[PDB]
Amino acid sequence: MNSPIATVEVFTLTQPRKVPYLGALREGEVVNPNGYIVRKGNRTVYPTFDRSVLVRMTTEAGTVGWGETYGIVAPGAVAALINDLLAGFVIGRDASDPSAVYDDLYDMMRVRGYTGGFYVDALAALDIALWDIAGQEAGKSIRDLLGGGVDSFPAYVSGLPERTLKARGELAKYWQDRGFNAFKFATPVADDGPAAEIANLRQVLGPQAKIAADMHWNQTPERALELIAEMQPFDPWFAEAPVWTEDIAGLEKVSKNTDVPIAVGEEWRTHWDMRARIERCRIAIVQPEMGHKGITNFIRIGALAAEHGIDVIPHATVGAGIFLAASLQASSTLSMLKGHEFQHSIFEPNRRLLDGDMDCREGRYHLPSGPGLGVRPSEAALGLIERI
Amino acid sequence: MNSPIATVEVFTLTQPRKVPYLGALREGEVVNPNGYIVRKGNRTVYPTFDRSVLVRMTTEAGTVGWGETYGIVAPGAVAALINDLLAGFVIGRDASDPSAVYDDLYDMMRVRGYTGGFYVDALAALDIALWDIAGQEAGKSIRDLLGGGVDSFPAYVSGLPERTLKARGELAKYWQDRGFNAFKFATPVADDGPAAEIANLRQVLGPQAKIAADMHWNQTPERALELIAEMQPFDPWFAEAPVWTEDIAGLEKVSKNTDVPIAVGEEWRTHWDMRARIERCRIAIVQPEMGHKGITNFIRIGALAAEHGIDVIPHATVGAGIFLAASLQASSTLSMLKGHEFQHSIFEPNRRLLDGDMDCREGRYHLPSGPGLGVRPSEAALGLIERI
Ligand code: NA
Ligand code: NA
Numbered sequence: 001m002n003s004p005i006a007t008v009e010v011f012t013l014t015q016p017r018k019v020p021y022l023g024a025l026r027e028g029e030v031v032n033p034n035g036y037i038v039r040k041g042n043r044t045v046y047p048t049f050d051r052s053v054l055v056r057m058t059t060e061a062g063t064v065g066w067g068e069t070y071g072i073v074a075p076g077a078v079a080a081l082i083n084d085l086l087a088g089f090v091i092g093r094d095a096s097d098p099s100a101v102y103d104d105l106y107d108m109m110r111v112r113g114y115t116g117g118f119y120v121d122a123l124a125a126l127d128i129a130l131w132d133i134a135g136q137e138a139g140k141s142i143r144d145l146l147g148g149g150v151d152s153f154p155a156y157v158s159g160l161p162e163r164t165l166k167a168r169g170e171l172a173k174y175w176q177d178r179g180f181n182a183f184k185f186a187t188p189v190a191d192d193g194p195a196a197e198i199a200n201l202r203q204v205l206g207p208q209a210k211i212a213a214d215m216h217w218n219q220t221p222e223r224a225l226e227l228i229a230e231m232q233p234f235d236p237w238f239a240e241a242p243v244w245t246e247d248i249a250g251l252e253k254v255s256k257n258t259d260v261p262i263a264v265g266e267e268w269r270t271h272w273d274m275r276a277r278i279e280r281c282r283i284a285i286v287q288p289e290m291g292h293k294g295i296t297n298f299i300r301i302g303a304l305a306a307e308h309g310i311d312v313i314p315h316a317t318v319g320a321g322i323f324l325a326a327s328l329q330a331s332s333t334l335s336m337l338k339g340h341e342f343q344h345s346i347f348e349p350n351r352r353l354l355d356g357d358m359d360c361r362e363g364r365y366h367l368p369s370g371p372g373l374g375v376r377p378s379e380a381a382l383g384l385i386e387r388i
Numbered sequence: 389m390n391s392p393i394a395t396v397e398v399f400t401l402t403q404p405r406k407v408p409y410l411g412a413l414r415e416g417e418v419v420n421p422n423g424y425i426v427r428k429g430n431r432t433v434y435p436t437f438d439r440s441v442l443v444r445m446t447t448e449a450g451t452v453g454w455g456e457t458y459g460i461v462a463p464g465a466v467a468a469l470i471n472d473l474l475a476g477f478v479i480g481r482d483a484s485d486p487s488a489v490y491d492d493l494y495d496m497m498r499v500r501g502y503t504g505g506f507y508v509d510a511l512a513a514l515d516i517a518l519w520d521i522a523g524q525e526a527g528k529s530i531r532d533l534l535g536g537g538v539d540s541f542p543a544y545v546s547g548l549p550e551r552t553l554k555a556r557g558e559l560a561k562y563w564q565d566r567g568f569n570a571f572k573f574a575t576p577v578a579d580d581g582p583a584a585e586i587a588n589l590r591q592v593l594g595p596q597a598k599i600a601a602d603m604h605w606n607q608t609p610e611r612a613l614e615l616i617a618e619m620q621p622f623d624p625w626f627a628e629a630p631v632w633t634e635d636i637a638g639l640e641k642v643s644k645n646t647d648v649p650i651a652v653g654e655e656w657r658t659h660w661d662m663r664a665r666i667e668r669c670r671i672a673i674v675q676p677e678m679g680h681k682g683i684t685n686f687i688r689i690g691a692l693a694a695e696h697g698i699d700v701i702p703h704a705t706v707g708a709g710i711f712l713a714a715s716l717q718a719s720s721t722l723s724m725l726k727g728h729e730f731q732h733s734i735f736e737p738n739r740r741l742l743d744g745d746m747d748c749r750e751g752r753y754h755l756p757s758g759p760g761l762g763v764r765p766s767e768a769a770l771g772l773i774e775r776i
Contacts, residue, residue, distance in 0.1 A: 032476040033479075042499070044500075073497065074468045076465075081464075089422075089621025108432060109432070110432075111604070112627075113655030116501060116508060117501065117502045117507055245501060246503055248664060267499060275634075275637070293502075344598055
């Protein structure tokens with residue numbers, strides 16, 4: 001029934017970015033070795049390309065599962081973890097209980113403090129591939145295997161890649177006319193500030209639209225609160241990532257001193273990360289990123305949200321569509337799911353990279369139909385992947 | 389004058405000697421074909437060879453600094469991080485303000501959640517190399533660059549690698565007679581349990597000996613409190629790692645419900661990790677590991693401990709002697725320093741792998757003389773290093 005894992009193969013898929021992105025670099029920033037650039041304003045490194053890490057996992061019987069995680073930065077890190085260490089402890093196991101395999105792999109390195117970061121990125125890719133196999137072997141979609149899920153849910157527009165405030169609103173209105181009712185903007189994009197941006201968006205989109213602000217971490221708690229106050233006359237849906245990730249005291253302060261819902265969680269890895277915040281802060285929404293987390297982690301974060309009446313609105317990002325499909329599968333089973341980030345500019349071009357009916361239209365994701373993940377890399381994608 | 393960094397070279401060094409496991413290999417334990425072994429107790433993975441990652445960093449003027457981090461598992465992860473991402477951001481910088489460079493590197497990935505693990509392992513190795521250069525350029529030891537430190541301080545015996553209770557007591561006494569006054573044992577080891585072990589050690593060593601219990605993580609807070617209460621009559625020096633690292637609520641419960649000092653922190657990476665625990669828990673002792681952390685992080689943790697009256701008792705782990713030399717340099721400056729882990733099997737490799745006069749004799753560490761770290765790899769070590 002469940003055939004042992006025979007092989008674990010790691011790949012990268014690297015392609016040119018197809019969105020204007022270098023407009024964010026306004027301070028004379030220079031490309032560093034291997035194509036990296038640091039934005040001076042937030043000190044964060046960015047790739048000059050799109051890249052993710054893909055895993056092909058094959059049973060003795062020939063069932064092929066796929067997983068994926070972040071590969072934008074030093075994909076050799078995940079590749080080393082899998083090739084040197086983790087693959088050996090997956091091979092010979094089977095997919096009868098994927099979460100048991102995850103928990104064993106996690107346990108190998110937890111006491112040495114590798115409880116997140118690249119280690120969990122690696123585990124995420126293996127976990128998605130193993131659940132894909134489990135579903136295929138059962139003849140069930142992952143969501144079915146997880147107890148049942150819905151086949152569609154709301155999607156919000158993320159990413160307004162235009163140079164001017166005016167053109168950003170025109171882009172949002174274009175998406176509104178396509179049947180989207182929920183939107184998010186990033187505060188560093190906003191030249192006259194987040195208040196002027198939300199003011200424009202609110203005017204353009206009308207009072208019924210949901211308009212969230214991604215505050216993108218780089219504030220003191222006091223400044224975060226000031227900016228949230230400036231935005232609040234325009235009815236923000238939520239304020240996301242008001243302070244640095246490490247600053248739980250600062251998040252606590254922000255969350256207890258505004259009524260604007262606070263959303264966090266894209267950069268977490270496990271429910272343990274969630275526990276550290278919700279035990280201290282007022283968190284309205286969690287925003288898990290499947291590519292960092294894997295299905296086992298995502299399901300446990302979802303269950304913890306249900307315990308505390310916290311809404312779940314998952315993140316989305318640069319990737320081939322494999323971890324996104326995983327996100328949809330897992331998200332669909334969650335009682336606290338309100339909807340899901342939609343990166344139109346990433347999703348649209350990568351239809352070519354996938355076999356499988358995953359769609360997003362008229363403000364809703366439509367889940368794929370097949371057993372397991374329901375998607376796989378297309379023949380075109382297989383021509384592009386490189387071994388790592 | 390501080391000359392800009394020209395080159396960053398990454399190596400592994402695999403040792404011809406092997407530190408004992410604490411806990412004899414047991415029926416059913418498997419040597420994986422990948423060269424790793426998972427232990428039946430905590431399900432932590434262990435290597436079959438001791439190995440660390442070394443970094444040689446060279447200025448344009450030709451000053452050579454050395455750093456070191458963990459390499460026991462998947463050293464390709466750190467190597468990829470350094471070769472692909474980090475080295476390019478260090479090249480061109482100088483050692484005038486090593487902590488500024490550390491901060492810039494850390495900031496590149498913090499919003500994506502890479503705030504620890506292998507990322508900070510890699511930063512630790514670079515940070516140690518940069519301080520080594522800074523010292524040599526100033527003609528000052530690292531401790532003198534940091535405002536001055538002691539030239540020696542007490543070491544304690546951090547574990548007792550023998551296969552019986554009786555033999556571990558005899559080994560403790562052997563070290564007591566050779567100048568040691570403080571000892572630690574691992575609670576899962578004795579067949580009769582940790583109360584039986586501490587009772588034996590107390591009887592063998594006498595009232596004056598400090599005897600700590602390393603609880604090795606795998607307890608509920610309730611079970612940890614039960615075991616601590618059983619050991620309590622025998623005057624434990626501290627109870628280390630009573631619950632899982634991620635279980636901050638569990639650590640709070642333990643620390644608030646025993647008067648036995650609680651010690652944690654070898655598997656942390658930054659002062660952020662400390663802040664998350666000390667805000668909620670009663671921590672008596674922090675135990676930073678230089679190989680995971682680097683000088684910048686280690687000193688910040690020391691300063692935070694000083695602010696809160698928390699004792700600092702650093703960890704030690706097998707390596708070539710580079711991160712250990714860094715540990716002694718940084719520890720020597722700390723007002724809260726109350727000792728430092730030692731084991732014969734951990735220290736001994738550095739006698740052949742390092743040139744320099746770092747020592748441990750009669751139960752005390754003695755710091756090397758000379759600028760920077762005051763040590764560098766020996767001809768033997770330069771022979772054995774392999775590029776990665
Ligand atoms: Na997010
Ligand atoms: Na320790």
